[PDB]
Design a protein around this ligand. Sequence first.
Ligand SMILES: CNC(=O)[C@H](NC(=O)c1ccc(-c2ccc(CSc3nc4c(c(=O)[nH]3)CCC4)cc2)o1)C(C)C
Ligand SMILES: [Ca+2]
Ligand SMILES: [Ca+2]
Ligand SMILES: [Ca+2]
Ligand SMILES: [Zn+2]
Ligand SMILES: [Zn+2]
Lengths: 5, 155
Amino acid sequence: VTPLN
Amino acid sequence: LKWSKMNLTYRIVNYTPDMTHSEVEKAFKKAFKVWSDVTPLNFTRLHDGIADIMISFGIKEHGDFYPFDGPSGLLAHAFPPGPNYGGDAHFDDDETWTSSSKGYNLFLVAAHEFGHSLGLDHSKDPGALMFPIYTYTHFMLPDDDVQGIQSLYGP
Ligand SMILES: CNC(=O)[C@H](NC(=O)c1ccc(-c2ccc(CSc3nc4c(c(=O)[nH]3)CCC4)cc2)o1)C(C)C
Ligand SMILES: [Ca+2]
Ligand SMILES: [Ca+2]
Ligand SMILES: [Ca+2]
Ligand SMILES: [Zn+2]
Ligand SMILES: [Zn+2]
């Protein structure tokens, strides 16, 4: 899962 | 994505050079209180072992293969609710973290990151805490953010 900035 | 429990833990794994431990702790506590004040969520701090929300400061490649980019640009990132990296929040220490109008205000960025940690995406409302672009204007959680977090967890 790609983290959000 | 959403936590299926209301009582969450966090751990401050390490600290920025930029601020005292006490000021970092104060900023993160205030940032969690933003969300606990308008939901049934509760947050407790742990000093060892595994917490739901693991918080750390790092630069460039720092362990998760989502690297930071040096000074400017990316500030921080957080993973949506889930096991392992889920919920965790990482801050780019190539930025200067403050409790002022200078550099980047750690409380404001942390409150935004913990929004992601709890399952919020970005807002299109330019005044929202969860707007994607950082600006620095007594803090009051904007109404879009109240609406968004209560949709997941209720009041
Ligand atoms: C892909 N993103 C980026 O590269 C950078 N952004 C980030 O990396 C990042 C990480 C976290 C945030 C972020 C944090 C807080 C805000 C809201 S700032 C803010 N929010 C509010 C107030 C205020 O004074 N300031 C008063 C009420 C709500 C926005 C973005 O931005 C930036 C160059 C756009
Ligand atoms: Ca950066
Ligand atoms: Ca986690
Ligand atoms: Ca720094
Ligand atoms: Zn964001
Ligand atoms: Zn990371």
